[PDB]
RNA sequence: GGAUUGAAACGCCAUGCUCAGGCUGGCGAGUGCGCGCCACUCAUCAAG
């Protein structure tokens, strides 16, 4: 259920979507890790709307990005 | 129920491969070559 179908990105790009239960299956990226650069966070509604970024690492395929609700990377 | 640099977003309108042009003119399968040389139907059996 959904209150409407998620896309990825665009609406055009439906998003078939899955709760999982149990451990996460085996990226194509285990063993690598890749640097991606600065990308988007979130949008600072709350600060007219500013942009925030962060570098992205991509170690073995997860990316961890910092809490955007944090006062260190907000304005 | 506020925000997935999102929410909205046609490649679309239309356009003969056509006009046409012998595969033709003509060329003996032909000259010739015994099925032939031989070979008993035959040795018997009343008519009732």
């Known amino acids: 259920q959904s209150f409407q179908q998620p896309c990825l990105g665009c609406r055009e790009f439906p998003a078939s979507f899955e709760l999982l239960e149990g451990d996460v299956p085996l990226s194509c990226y285990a063993g690598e890790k890749r640097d991606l650069g ?22 073995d395929g997860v990316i961890t990005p910092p809490s955007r609700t944090s006062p260190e990377v907000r304005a």
């Open 38 to 59: 600065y990308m988007l966070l979130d949008i600072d509604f709350e600060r007219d709307m500013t942009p925030l970024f962060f570098k992205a690492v991509m170690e």
